[PDB]
Design a binder for this molecule. Sequence first.
Ligand SMILES: *[C@@H]1O[C@H](CO)[C@@H](O)[C@H](O)[C@H]1NC(C)=O
Ligand SMILES: *[C@@H]1O[C@H](CO)[C@@H](O)[C@H](O)[C@H]1NC(C)=O
Ligand SMILES: *[C@@H]1O[C@H](CO)[C@@H](O)[C@H](O)[C@H]1NC(C)=O
Lengths: 439, 52
Amino acid sequence: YEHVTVIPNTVGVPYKTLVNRPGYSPMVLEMELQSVTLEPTLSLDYITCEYKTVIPSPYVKCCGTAECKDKSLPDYSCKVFTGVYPFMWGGAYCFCDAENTQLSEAHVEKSESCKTEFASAYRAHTASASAKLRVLYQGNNITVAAYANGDHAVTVKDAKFVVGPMSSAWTPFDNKIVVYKGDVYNMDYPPFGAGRPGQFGDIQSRTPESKDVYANTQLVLQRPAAGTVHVPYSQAPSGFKYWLKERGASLQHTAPFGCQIATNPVRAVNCAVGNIPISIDIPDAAFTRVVDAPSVTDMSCEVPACTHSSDFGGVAIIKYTASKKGKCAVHSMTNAVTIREADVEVEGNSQLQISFSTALASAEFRVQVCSTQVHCAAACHPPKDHIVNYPASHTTLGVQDISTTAMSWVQKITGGVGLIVAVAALILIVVLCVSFSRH
Amino acid sequence: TVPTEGLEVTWGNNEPYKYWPQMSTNGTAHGHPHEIILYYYELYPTMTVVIV
Ligand SMILES: *[C@@H]1O[C@H](CO)[C@@H](O)[C@H](O)[C@H]1NC(C)=O
Ligand SMILES: *[C@@H]1O[C@H](CO)[C@@H](O)[C@H](O)[C@H]1NC(C)=O
Ligand SMILES: *[C@@H]1O[C@H](CO)[C@@H](O)[C@H](O)[C@H]1NC(C)=O
């Protein structure tokens, strides 16, 4: 026997469904879900980190001319200066007082620290989904886990469950993301080979194990100071250090729909969007014929109290006479009222109690116990508590859901105006007809 | 202020708080006509004015 239902994607709220087949006793199931996870697919473009500058000892040639050649190293620079006269602690270094030169050079390499402190840029693609579900079945609590699509089934106590697919394709991630030690940011990083001297991406590498490094920092050599041996230079500061101090809030705090983020692997959980279909397959051996089940023949209903608050603020008493000892299922026949109990124990001639919640100002509903029905009605009052720490257990109301007193007043006013229009119309018709015919 | 969908608040290194509104009125859905209008106005201000 196949059964299909749809449950909204609301974590922490139980729902109930009724399954029956003619000739056999009905069953009521209760379901509640605990977690939903989405997982994207990632691809790596490049990583960034800090840079190091290497400067060897300078070469000084007095009363001769120095020269240098080009090299293939990144950001290589070379210059020759004239007119130097260096000193040391013991006196002037070389005999010649004129026509001296100095040679300076430098280049840029990748820092050793890049093995621990780095950031990576990813491209995102279509995500998968999974869910964890709790089921109350025949008085026992069981748990299942499955993929949120039609390609997986789980069997527990000789019953099969299939979940999914999801009704919505909304995903909190953009096409370009950046990940750093647990934080995920949305950022349109520049393409490889097109960096800027003082921004994110000034140094780029394909992978921590690569030898080929790109950089576009500024590096200019300057003239040395009189009497001093040194190599002054001007260089733009590292962009990576600046980003860390100005990066702002991550998606964990700004994302909509209450989503939460994890990074190992990248995931998003508990996003309150859409609904999830479920299909169940129950074997024939689980059903009992109505000739063996107990029956109830005479019932009536009274409702001594109702407050239409977010919690179970209603109570009802039902009278019954039962044919023999056994159990019955209880289910509501309306959408505006939810009943907490799943089953009852019945014996002899007695009464049972149930509780319910509703948003209606005036409530009418039917209740079914062991395949027979009663009618209940009552008026409800408002609560006085402004704020609570939990979501409501009931649905919203529509435009037609108004009190009986309001409806009565509407009919009286509309009828009065309609009557006066009809009378005026009748007067005109007789006058117009007679004048036509009299001529 | 607390909207219908609820508010989330975090302070320091502690855990977040969550709040939801609940219905409350000073009027009533039963009795005199002018008391009925107040009941609905306090719950759905925009729709009440337009319909009337
Ligand atoms: C721990 O160190 C390894 C390399 O030494 C690095 O790959 C990893 O990201 C570090 N873990 C954390 C949490 O910083
Ligand atoms: C386990 O089943 C009992 C009824 O037998 C129920 O009261 C209880 O809430 C269930 N456990 C959970 C975690 O809901
Ligand atoms: C109702 O009247 C009380 C009087 O104390 C006031 O505090 C409250 O704001 C009024 N409105 C509601 C919705 O309770």
